[PDB]
Amino acid sequence: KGLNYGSFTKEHVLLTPKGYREWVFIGASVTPNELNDDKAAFPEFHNVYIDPTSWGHWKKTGEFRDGTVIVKELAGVGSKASPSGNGYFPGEFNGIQAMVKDSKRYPERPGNWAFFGFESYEAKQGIIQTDETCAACHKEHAAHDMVFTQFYPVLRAGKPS
């Protein structure tokens, strides 16, 4: 049996995840403000994690099990140049988004993914999102089961032959 990494309210809302920084990192991208008219949709660095149980299952199957939790952690750009050269380097943490795959808890949602926003790191739980607010952009464009695995080299290298 595998361990369940998310905790949920009676209404199936994901409680604010603790310890996700010790989950399995799958990739990082950066949409800086200065390259998006000074207001990026999701500022700015994005560090992404999958719970360890679903990583074991992805390692053996290449699919996201029932119970997958993915957390995307946002951080600011801290600087543009360092002794290694020019670019983007992280500053401080900004917030988190999450998505959860569960046919039992979300049978009507596209892919059985529930997308969660979080009003702060202090909040008790996430806020479940409307289909147009998140799932639409992901189904339209993500490379596998509504997860942008074209940007998770850890997942592509870790899936079986």
Which residues participate in the annotated binding site?
46, 72, 84, 134, 137-138, 148, 152
**Binding flag, residue 99, ligand HEC (CB under 6 A):** yes
The values of phi and psi at residue 45, to 5°, are -70, 140
In angstroms, the CA 110 to CA 133 distance is: 12
What 3-state DSSP class applies to 128? strand
By CB under 6 A, what part of segment 13-42 binds ligand HEC? 29, 31
8 Å CB contact between 70 and 48: yes
**Binding flag, residue 133, ligand HEC (CB under 6 A):** yes
Q: Which stretch binds ligand HEC (CB under 6 A): 8-16, 60-68, 104-112, 137-145?
A: 137-145
8 Å CB contact between 46 and 123: no
Binding site for ligand HEC (CB under 6 A): 29, 31, 46, 48, 70, 72, 82-84, 97-99, 115-117, 129, 133-134, 137-138, 142, 147-148, 151
